[PDB]
Amino acid sequence: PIAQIHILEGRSDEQKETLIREVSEAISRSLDAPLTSVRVIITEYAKGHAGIGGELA
Amino acid sequence: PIAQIHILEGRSDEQKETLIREVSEAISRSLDAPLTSVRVIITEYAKGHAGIGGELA
Amino acid sequence: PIAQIHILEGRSDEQKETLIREVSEAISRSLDAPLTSVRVIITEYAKGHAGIGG
Amino acid sequence: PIAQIHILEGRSDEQKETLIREVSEAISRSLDAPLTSVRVIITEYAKGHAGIGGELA
Amino acid sequence: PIAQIHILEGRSDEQKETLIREVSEAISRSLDAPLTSVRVIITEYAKGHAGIGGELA
Amino acid sequence: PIAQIHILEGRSDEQKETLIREVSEAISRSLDAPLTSVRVIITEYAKGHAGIGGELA
């Protein structure tokens, strides 16, 4: 299983590594899939690259 | 935050509902963002649409 | 420019055709890019495949 | 509704802000969906990262 | 490496198996990366879900 | 056809140009599609943005 996670930039390396672990575990638990088979890639977005309702976040 | 989860098909409806909640939950925790801001979309793949070594799965 | 639009299923052929038209125009106009260079792909999601906050 | 938009780098913030807004409205009108439910994320690509026909764009 | 390939529907299983192999080999060869580390996932699009210039392809 | 290729950062422009071409050739070859219709976009990921099993690379 492969997860692409789109988040706004500004988080620390530690916060994002925690994100990777917990999401991977969340994926593994929900599916009864081996944790080792879980892949996560993070994509960050600058504020001028993210919209909610036609307006920037 | 937006999470795209790519999985092989064949798993049950409830697992995918659990997947959505817990991934949503894990992201909210890791980033301390409101759950309402978290969106999860699942894409399933038939065996002929997935490769790992140039070979199907 | 490439736009991938993720939507919940249930929309009409006309709405999704209109979506392609209007999004393409918006991209071309906003960026001053040639319309012919704009590609849009639509992906539908059954409700059980799309989630908000749980 | 979620729109991921891939564009070549080199545009100004104002153009990309117009892009997010104008695209979001277009999605809202076309689908009869609430504007606030429309999400747009922009990804920029350097010239060496985009190909059209095996050749860089 | 992860490759998402978006194509119009209508191809045979065998063509798409070839797609997975040939692309995976190309990724492995171009990058000098182990073939086993290369993942390919295919997404198909009906003609009404794909546009080239605001018009269906 | 549209190919998004996710790779770890650190490669030179020349290798990634080779990646784009060979992947483009493989796609055209596999599907019997005109090369000019093949689009490839590369997205790079820093080491802290990629996880395999809850852990970084």
Numbering used by the authors:
A (entry chain F), B (entry chain E), D (entry chain D), E (entry chain B), F (entry chain A): 1 to 57
C (entry chain C): 1 to 54
Paper text:
The enzyme 4-oxalocrotonate tautomerase (4-OT) is composed of six identical subunits of only 62 amino acid residues each. 4-OT takes part in a catabolic pathway for aromatic hydrocarbons in Pseudomonas putida mt-2, where it catalyses the tautomerization of 2-hydroxymuconate (1) to yield 2-oxohex-3-enedioate (2). Inspired by the versatile success of proline and its derivatives as organocatalysts, we anticipated and found the proline-based enzyme 4-OT to promiscuously catalyse carbon–carbon bond-forming reactions such as aldolizations and Michael-type additions.
The phenyl group of 5a makes van der Waals contacts with residues Pro-1, His-6, Ile-7, Leu-8 and Ile-41 in the hydrophobic pocket, whereas the nitro group is in van der Waals contact with Ser-37 and forms a salt bridge with the guanidinium group of Arg-39. The central ethylene group of 5a is only ∼3 Å away from the amino group of Pro-1. In conclusion, our results reveal that the two mutations (M45Y and F50A) unexpectedly created a new substrate-binding pocket. This active-site remodelling is most probably responsible for the observed differences in activity and enantioselectivity between mutant and wild-type 4-OT. The progress curves of these reactions demonstrate that this mutant, in addition to inverted enantioselectivity, also has significantly enhanced ‘Michaelase' activity for the addition of 3 to 5a, as well as 4 to 5a when compared with wild-type 4-OT.
